[PDB]
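Honest question from a wet-lab person: if I give you the sequences of every part of a complex, can you actually get the arrangement of the whole thing, not just the pieces? Trying it with mine:
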Amino acid sequence: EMTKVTGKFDVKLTPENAYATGVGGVNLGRMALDKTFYGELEARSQGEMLSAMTAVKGSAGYVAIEQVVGKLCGRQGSFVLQHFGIMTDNRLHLEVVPHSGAGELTGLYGTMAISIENGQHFYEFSFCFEP
Amino acid sequence: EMTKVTGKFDVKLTPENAYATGVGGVNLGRMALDKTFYGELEARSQGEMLSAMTAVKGSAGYVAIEQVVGKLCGRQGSFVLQHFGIMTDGQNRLHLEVVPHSGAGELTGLYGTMAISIENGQHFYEFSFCFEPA
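Yes, you can. This is the full assembly:
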């Protein structure tokens, strides 16, 4: 039922000042996100990420929301991706926010995955359209 | 068995400037969060939330990270809570967990998930927690 595509993306993450302060070995972060997707998703995104690093190695959490604008498989539109990640020594959920799809991407539903191979970021996007 | 404690909390949301701009009917937000928990979790927290409201009533998403400081069943410490909420048709499906190894002080090793309810206009937390072996 899901269409499945992969491609490359670039990401730039600019530090920002976090409202709250970490205690007990926690360090909190806020970052601005700018990304460019190439291939079947040919798009630009902007958003923000929040982060919490703990005093234990490899243990951290991230969340983000990003607005994507471009083309998916030729259809011009926009949608929002919402991220939840927990690294303990990794669990990542990246989901299209329901009814965030607009333009020719109205009705979009789906989830994305990512990886990094030799410094190159890649995405997989599993998606479909609500009838 | 997990211990499950229930109690009141209040939250203040202060609007901040979101980096991105929503399009296609989406409105994106960033807010500062200041909360107070009462009862078995007696604590204060600060953090931020990011939200996306869509053009369709009852459909939205939000995420947040907050640092909690206070007492849980009498023991003083801190931990971080991490939220991921997706609402469709007005029904929020919320995942809210303690970030592993964020527990400090006497709450070192804290593990847990929290649910959020409302009764007569008052928010309540239901917090199921335990501790990992020292």
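Two things worth pointing out. Chain A touches chain B through 51 residues (CB under 8 Å). DSSP finds no helices and nine strands in chain A.
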